[PDB]
DNA sequence: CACAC
DNA sequence: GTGTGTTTTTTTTTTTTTTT
């Protein structure tokens with residue numbers, strides 16, 4: 001629910017580290033044109049007097065930008081949000097509020113879109129997803145649970161061809177079925193199997209299939 | 211008298227059903243099924259009671275499961291802002307008191323009304339129904355079924371009335387809906403409570419090139435100024451008039 | 458003689474010992490059992506010549522090494538920690554802002570190492586030095602109901 | 608090998624104040640190559656202390 | 661028991677089973693409350709008495725209650741092929757009463 | 758109790 | 763002169779209880 005999330009980092013690299021530390025040393029030397037104060041009421045005057053008004057050309061620019069984002073994100077992986085469209089609209093309105101134009105021009109639309117796209121490439125992984133932000137369970141994570149649920153179902157059916165506790169399930173899943181995967185994934189997938197009524201769990205102990 | 215004439219035009223209208231369906235949540239494009247379900251929930255049934263003293267629910271309980279980008283929260287906002295005696299709540303349980311009620315000691319035990327109490331004879335707009343733990347879902351099992359909550363914790367024992375309509379909006383398990391599994395599979399929410407829900411609405415954000423264009427254009431056009439067949443004030447009087455009916 | 462005392466004073470106070478009475482109605486309730494107080498008359502605290510003397514110490518004794526051992530003469534080893542303690546006691550000065558002149562160190566150490574003794578010595582040697590444990594600072598409000606102080 | 612060994616501008620502020628204290632004990636304006644060498648030696652000794660053995 | 665706000669002492673007030681003495685007590689969702697709360701009714705449903713030995717107050721109340729409880733089978737559905745104990749989460753002593 | 762109302 | 767009115771206190775410390 002944040003329109004912009006900035007991943008401000010201090011990653012090590014001697015080129016920019018030299019410049020930053022030199023600026024720090026200049027700052028140390030300092031103590032022993034910029035509107036420094038006029039902005040604090042300039043912003044208020046812009047907020048009061050200026051009422052941004054967004055145009056139909058801005059509308060078309062916004063629509064094309066959003067559909068382009070959806071397709072570039074596009075298994076057609078979901079990307080960004082209609083809320084992200086609301087965010088670009090609001091950022092373009094803000095860009096209209098500054099420079100005292102009170103009209104959301106076309107340029108503001110692509111400026112806000114560029115800011116949003118840069119932020120998205122920042123906070124998302126290298127294969128920009130647009131889904132990890134709204135959900136901890138990413139596609140590359142959801143595939144793990146979808147594998148574990150079917151693996152558990154098949155293992156149960158093989159056992160029947162009857163009931164075992166959690167530790168025995170761990171013995172024949174993490175050892176030879178696959179690598180040393182996390183244990184709670186098994187019970188999380190068993191919950192999903194319970195939702196589909198495929199198997200039943202008899203308390204903390206044994207568990208069987210219907 | 212002018213409102214009498216407006217109501218007479220409303221009742222004598224032939225496409226009044228479809229017009230009201232379209233007039234529900236003008237801020238939302240499409241999803242006419244959800245609009246119809248919300249309209250029915252607002253109308254409700256008849257809260258009959260048998261001679262043996264057993265009461266029969268007239269409230270309608272609706273759970274609208276959908277992806278995070280869907281318009282669940284917008285529907286909840288429209289309902290809470292339009293339906294009288296309606297409150298909004300989330301599955302996070304922001305209030306210290308539980309979603310039903312709570313008892314608190316004074317420095318004696320006194321009752322703090324939950325989100326389920328204030329919306330009595332109205333609609334309890336519930337968000338993030340998947341976020342709330344089943345520990346609180348079981349607390350509303352009797353509330354959304356028997357319309358009552360019985361509490362006997364410490365020195366206080368009473369049964370409070372919850373004659374509310376529940377509007378649940380929960381994301382499917384894993385955030386995104388999975389059509390490969392049934393509605394039971396796509397939710398962590400369990401059978402006994404959903405058997406008490408009347409209708410289930412599944413809304414998905416299909417990666418359709420055109421549908422996204424109409425959605426974006428509609429949103430920007432709303433940002434411009436939606437023309438509903440009947441206004442909210444005009445609709446409320448007809449809803450009140452229909453509530454007087456006991457078919 | 459007012460304002461000559463503070464709570465952190467260990468003093469030899471000489472004064473007149475007088476029976477402050479419960480004058481009013483409480484005298485009837487209590488009776489001959491009176492209360493006492495001292496009408497203090499005198500107070501004695503207990504608690505560049507030195508500047509030339511400290512140049513003399515600087516020229517003679519190597520402060521970096523000698524005062525390091527002087528901080529913890531009864532503690533053997535960890536002389537570099539003692540030098541760090543000297544540096545903390547001296548402290549930087551960068552009051553100009555645009556930072557801070559307080560040096561802060563944490564002694565995680567190891568149980569059984571005389572960290573507590575080092576802290577006690579620092580408290581006994583640092584002016585305005587206080588010592589406390591993690592579990593006992595903070596602040597309190599209106600502790601006595603009668604006066605209702607602030 | 609431990610990630611706590613990363614150098615930060617906060618370490619620079621600490622080094623500056625340590626050098627200030629060092630010259631503070633030693634007359635005035637003793638912050639020079641010798642002062643910063645002593646401060647950096649102490650800082651590196653402290654850092655290696657965390658990596659003792 | 662509770663400290664009296666007016667007279668400042670511990671006093672004992674009866675619970676649900678006290679008000680249902682020589683009557684009936686109904687327990688909806690008998691499978692859904694805390695087991696530590698569920699075990700507090702053994703003396704009440706068998707000895708028909710409540711013994712309190714807390715805060716210096718020691719007494720034995722009488723609760724001639726008729727306990728009627730409603731539960732839900734494990735998973736929400738009753739598997740008839742299994743023994744009853746396997747279809748429930750409760751123990752023998754609570755089942756015995 | 759006893760001085761002040 | 764007959765008869766009043768104060769002084770006069772709810773802290774800190776245990777024990778319980780519901781949530782967390």
Ligand SMILES: Nc1ncnc2c1ncn2[C@@H]1O[C@H](COP(=O)(O)OP(=O)(O)OP(O)(O)=S)[C@@H](O)[C@H]1O
Nearest residue numbers: 082083237238239277278279280281282283284381
């Ligand atoms: N069909 C639609 N018509 C109009 N607005 C829509 C539609 N679908 C989504 N939106 C808008 O998209 C935004 C996000 O949807 P919400 O109603 O806020 O649901 P939500 O909060 O995303 O649900 P979650 O699961 O809690 S994230 C809101 O501003 C909605 O108005």
Ligand SMILES: Nc1ncnc2c1ncn2[C@@H]1O[C@H](COP(=O)(O)OP(=O)(O)OP(O)(O)=S)[C@@H](O)[C@H]1O
Nearest residue numbers: 531532533534566567568569570571572573574575
């Ligand atoms: N290097 C040392 N020189 C002199 N005495 C020492 C030395 N190391 C330990 N001691 C003695 O050890 C005791 C102090 O140890 P402590 O400081 O209490 O240990 P500790 O690491 O602080 O454990 P705590 O209190 O749980 S943090 C005193 O009796 C000291 O005399």
Ligand SMILES: [Mg+2]
Nearest residue numbers: 282283337338
């Ligand atoms: Mg929402």
Ligand SMILES: [Mg+2]
Nearest residue numbers: 571572573574
């Ligand atoms: Mg110690």
